[PDB]
Design a protein around this ligand. Structure first.
Ligand SMILES: O=C(O)[C@@H]1C[C@]2(C(=O)O)C=C[C@@H](O)[C@@H](C2)O1
Ligand SMILES: O=C(O)[C@@H]1C[C@]2(C(=O)O)C=C[C@@H](O)[C@@H](C2)O1
Ligand SMILES: O=C(O)[C@@H]1C[C@]2(C(=O)O)C=C[C@@H](O)[C@@H](C2)O1
Ligand SMILES: O=C(O)[C@@H]1C[C@]2(C(=O)O)C=C[C@@H](O)[C@@H](C2)O1
Lengths: 95, 91, 95, 91
């Protein structure tokens, strides 16, 4: 009976993976937009808000706040570094 | 606004992630019930190895590196074991 | 008779001035394009070519090479600094 | 190409500048003939002061600063005096 469920889990994980790829593509686009707008990569205000929104909505699914924070902390960290990778490249090229 | 239109996309995407994480917890509970009757132990380090390896393989196609995938999924699995062990201690 | 000619000179100078403003607007646009393309402001190859072209065409108008060089050296210097002003601003904003 | 289309505009503009500089030299020659008959001296530091001040005023409207205008026009005037003094030494 375990094999049936594990097969569902593996399918779900593949969907998570796809979304994670998509969010990473979005962070690159966002980084591009920051170069034009002359804004820095990191934006603490936005992260503060985003997390509060996620913790509020997570509550409805019974996902706890600390689980959501530990998880989005990795996701945001990754998207921040991805953008910083493009900034550094950019900075070496124009300079 | 350039910046704004993307963020709305990000916020919508993050909303979909929450739904999948909760659903995954549900499935972990089900697997929790099965190990109860079947009386199997919660942790199965071998399944976790194959699951992670498969995701790292699928991820390269998406241009997601193994480090980020390993870290993110170990946390999801960590929570998943926590979820099952709770179910067991309630029975 | 001098006043008649001086009146023509002043009109000509105003046209030169307008072109100088226009070339400065073009250098800003070019600078913007360099930020997207990730290219540095200065391009020695382009300046080398541009000057050779100007010296060749100048010959037809009887303008000598050294006069043309002294003059375009100021014009190019100015457009280089104008672009560097936008790069510096940009760099302080994204960083 | 973004970079290329602008450069063609710059190259065309530079071509117009050459035409005006040559024409200006012609006028300086004419003024050279007038000072010959009228027997006036080539250099007129007073006309140069008013000419430069006027250009600096017109230039602010174009967002061109006084430093660049002064430097560029002093060279054009410098060449202009050189042009006239040559005409005189040929007569
Ligand atoms: O500005 C942004 O929107 C992006 C996305 C980001 C996130 O991961 O959600 C949120 C805020 C910023 O610090 C970083 C990370 O850039
Ligand atoms: O048996 C299982 O399949 C479930 C799910 C789990 C996971 O989270 O993927 C993988 C293996 C086990 O350690 C735990 C966690 O139980
Ligand atoms: O790349 C460019 O085209 C612009 C214009 C410029 C010039 O003044 O003509 C020529 C070459 C570059 O060094 C600078 C100055 O940027
Ligand atoms: O008398 C003149 O008007 C001409 C032209 C000139 C200039 O280049 O503008 C201005 C004043 C004089 O010194 C010389 C140079 O002769």
């Amino acid at each position: 009976p375990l094999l049936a469920l594990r097969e569902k889990i593996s399918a779900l994980d593949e969907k998570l993976l796809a979304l994670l790829a998509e969010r990473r593509e979005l962070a690159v686009e966002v980084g591009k937009a920051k170069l034009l707008s002359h804004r820095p990569v990191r934006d603490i205000d936005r992260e503060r808000d985003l997390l509060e929104r996620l913790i509020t909505l997570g509550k409805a699914h019974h996902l706890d706040a600390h689980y959501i924070t530990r998880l989005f902390q990795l996701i945001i960290e990754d998207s921040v570094l991805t953008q910083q990778a493009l900034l550094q490249q950019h900075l070496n090229k124009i300079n």
